[PDB]
Design a protein around this ligand. Sequence first.
Ligand code: CA
Ligand code: CA
Ligand code: CA
Length: 1038
Amino acid sequence: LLREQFQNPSDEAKPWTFWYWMFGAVSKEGITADLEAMKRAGLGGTYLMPIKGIKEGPQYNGKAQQLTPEWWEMVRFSMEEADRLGLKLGMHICDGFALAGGPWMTPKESMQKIVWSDTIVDGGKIKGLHLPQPEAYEGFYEDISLFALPVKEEAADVMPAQITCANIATGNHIDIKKTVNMDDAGVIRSSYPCYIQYEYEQPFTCRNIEIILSGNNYQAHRLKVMASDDGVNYRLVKQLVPARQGWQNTDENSTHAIPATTARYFRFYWTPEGSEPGSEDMDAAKWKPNLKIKELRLHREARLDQWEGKAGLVWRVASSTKKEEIGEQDCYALSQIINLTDPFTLTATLPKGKWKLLRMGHTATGHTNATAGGGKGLECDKFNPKAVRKQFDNWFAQAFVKTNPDVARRVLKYMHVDSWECGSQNWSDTFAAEFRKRRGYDLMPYLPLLAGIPMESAERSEKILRDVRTTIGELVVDVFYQVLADCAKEYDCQFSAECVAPTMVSDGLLHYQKVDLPMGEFWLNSPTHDKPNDMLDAISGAHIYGKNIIQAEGFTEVRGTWNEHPGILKALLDRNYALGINRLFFHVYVHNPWLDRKPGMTLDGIGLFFQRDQTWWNKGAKAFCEYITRCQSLLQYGHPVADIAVFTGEEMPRRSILPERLVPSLPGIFGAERVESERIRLANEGQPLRVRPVGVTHSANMSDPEKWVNPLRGYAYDSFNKDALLRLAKAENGRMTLPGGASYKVLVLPLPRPMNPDPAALSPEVKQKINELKEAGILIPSLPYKEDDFSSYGLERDLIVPENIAWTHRQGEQGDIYFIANQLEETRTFTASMRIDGRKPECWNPVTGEINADIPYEQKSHRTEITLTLAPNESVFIVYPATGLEATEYTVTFTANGKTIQRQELFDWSKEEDEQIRYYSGTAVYKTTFRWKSKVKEDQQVYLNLGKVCDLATVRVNGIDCGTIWTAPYRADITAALKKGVNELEIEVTNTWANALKGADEGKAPFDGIWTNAKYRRAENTLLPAGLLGPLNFDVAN
Ligand SMILES: [Ca+2]
Ligand SMILES: [Ca+2]
Ligand SMILES: [Ca+2]
């Protein structure tokens, strides 16, 4: 029964935590303390991940370096204690955060890329010639093919230029030292509009510009290229366009093609005007709009525009190359190219003329699991099933050998793969063969496409490179994820996994079919580091592949500042429940090995600081986890409901679509106010900056997922890929269905968009299936869709609520559940109208566990309406079956320093003259008495309203616990504990660490033993309000 699950949830409904061990500083005492604390809070289990080692933190004197017998003994003891407590465990597939590295991996077994060298020679007889050696990572390299290409032009690929620059920004509020300048190493920097001029002694013919950076720089890709023959009259060549790119974009330079231009002068104009705000697929645009260029290389030889991404070396999307940039004369036909692989030093003969000797091979990409300690080394080849198996055998499998095997088999039941951060790869020893099987033709004659050298035509070159990227994405799934899935099943473990996008070339949804537990990620107060697109990848992936439990790495905080408590985490959690997550994992519980240092070890101040030495752990983490468990009990029930599927298209790479990107496709669904807010945000006038958190300056108009609650105004959608369309979709009763309960009425085929700008042509099999779905009744709306909703087609909104109300809907055999959550810090009363006809709603309170089965409701036009009142950040589930306190003198006892005071009136601890109270962080126990005049009458209900609580409070009346109050409304039901006459009142109030850390920083610690490696602090330098501020009142109801 649903009631029993809500009231007595199963262990599958409990939240979990990530558990990090820092710098090999680990103790058994701390292990016991941590795991008991986890059990006390109501956590179901933990993912044990050690982070860095003794070298990275020698000051901590760590005794548990990864893979030492001492470390293995800590792991064994952890399994022993989890077993004793009834907790389960997971581990990651490598040391550190990610991804699949270890000291057992050689360069040959690591991720591979196509590399090359080249040299121009006279044709005729060639004997004993030593060719240049391509890039060889740690000296590993293997030849594949040697081509000879007849030169298009005998002139040199680059020439000497004199480089100069000029500020063009004319005004009076310009810092002259930030205007364009070139340093002694030639690095170009600017904060203001400028140009950079290249002058050649003789006219130079340029066909592309290779942009070389030190780290990422969005602005560098926005140069406007101009040229002159005479030194004053300049003509437009091209406005350069930034390719879509993720944060891991430094492995390759960026080649921007232009129409072939012959000139003595080239000017590269720059202005920050027109800049797009930052996002996950224009990651560099998150940062200050300054220009910084290491080098511009102006090349003569023809290359495909943005070929480095198109070759699969790095995760990028750019438009196909225009014919005006690469025409037929710029391409090689296969007949022109002489294959010298056999004879190759080189000895053979060639027709007269000049030949480019293109020596192609492969080497390691150069990536490690760099956040590891003892387990650090090269990332495994993601296309080599033997290397993937080897990774599994040497870390995860050893947890069942080197510990206690029978205990390990009982408690270590989860195998985790985290979010990818090992770059991309476009080769392996089996890649040619896999390409041949999957794409239906041989890649090998076309291998120079992987260096961006065009063949046959631009269109043909880019059709083949798309096929290369497609193959890459398929091998991630069919090798890496398939092998690990087999391994997990072999070891009786559930497989959880985070995203592959936006660092490894992929269809970002595709791998979720191979795992048990798709896992998203959401950050707290960290706009520059949040991954809303990762969340939608994991949720869409789970929905379309029928994975019912959707995990989420939650609350990661780029700079924790010690003022965080559950009360300010609720709204954030709720909007991610609305997206579709149903098992939270706290990021992060750090192991604090010292029992006499608080709050102790952290991930160098990266939050959330969710651990035993939190001021609010014992009561606050427990109360929050109780709320979480009740929510998850219902949010794991049945199947999620979503009316709309949105096709993710045929470009590579690809992934789920953020709501903002569908606004031009569905302007009527989003509404006019959203259309207008997006116009302004994307215009991004003045490129404004914001600082959030302290010390992190970024693009103020960056999309913020807090502002995208219920963006379709009463419908939900999943992103939906080619795989799911062709392999899984069926039409039943006019809806598109998928195994595991997905059922969509609408299939949106979006307009061309930043991640699919061409757009990539629909394959015959996709057009056929679309038409089949169309004839069977699935709605394929014509775009842009301008009506408010789909009611004209018989598809009404699921839930009609006002703005800033987050929701989701699930359904199964026992009925329908709507989660409804207030995202504002205010009390609201509003109508909620649900697409449910003729059933009786109930209001189930997840904070308290109370069920109100007799709520008023109206039945209008075959919907059901209720009037809800929600306190700040309050949420509720709607389920459809199938007077002044007059206190005596307070005694207040500050538990952490034993100080006791007597006060008549309530007070803010932070305004006290006594420094040990002023800077106090921890718990204080308030004791008083109050008179209650009457016997409590039948059906009468009495609440003690607490007024303002800084930050949480546990109420006891005559010794009876009346609740831990942590979120609005700030009241406890004291009905059952009240007696006529004198009543005893005890309230335990707990704040956050911020005030005591400030005090300790200034030589005014309110007690002994305060220490943390977390050094970030609020910029404001204020003490936070602290304590039971009140006023206290009774609310007597019926
Ligand atoms: Ca992670
Ligand atoms: Ca499309
Ligand atoms: Ca897009």
